[PDB]
């Protein structure tokens, strides 16, 4: 895990990198969230702005405050019914991060 600094970013770049945790990540959907640790080596960000994005990872990263098994990431699935919501039919659609 290489501690990765945030340079000029914010919570809009966990938001996106989340969406590919909860993908195959280790962070499948039906799991617990890990530490703040995990999500900083992994998001270039600072330790403190996963927990910025967690609250749009509510709709985002499909999280909620589950008090039985704990924070886990079955909330709310992203209003995905085409490809255009996730991929964005104005950008090109290059490779994304198909298994991380």
């Known amino acids: 895990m290489p501690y990765k600094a945030p340079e000029g970013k914010g919570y809009a770049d966990v938001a996106t990198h989340f969406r ?3 993908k195959s990540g280790e962070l499948a959907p039906g799991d617990t969230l890990p530490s703040v640790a995990d999500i900083r080596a992994q998001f270039g960000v600072a330790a403190k ?3 910025r994005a967690l609250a749009v990872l509510k709709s985002e990263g499909l999280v909620s405050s589950r008090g039985a098994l704990g924070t886990v ?3 709310n699935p992203i209003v995905i019914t085409g490809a255009d919501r996730l991929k964005r039919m104005e ?3 290059m490779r994304y991060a198909p298994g991380e």
């Open 20 to 22: 590919t945790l909860i």
């Open 49 to 51: 702005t996963v927990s």
């Open 73 to 75: 990431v079955e909330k």
């Open 91 to 93: 950008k090109n659609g």
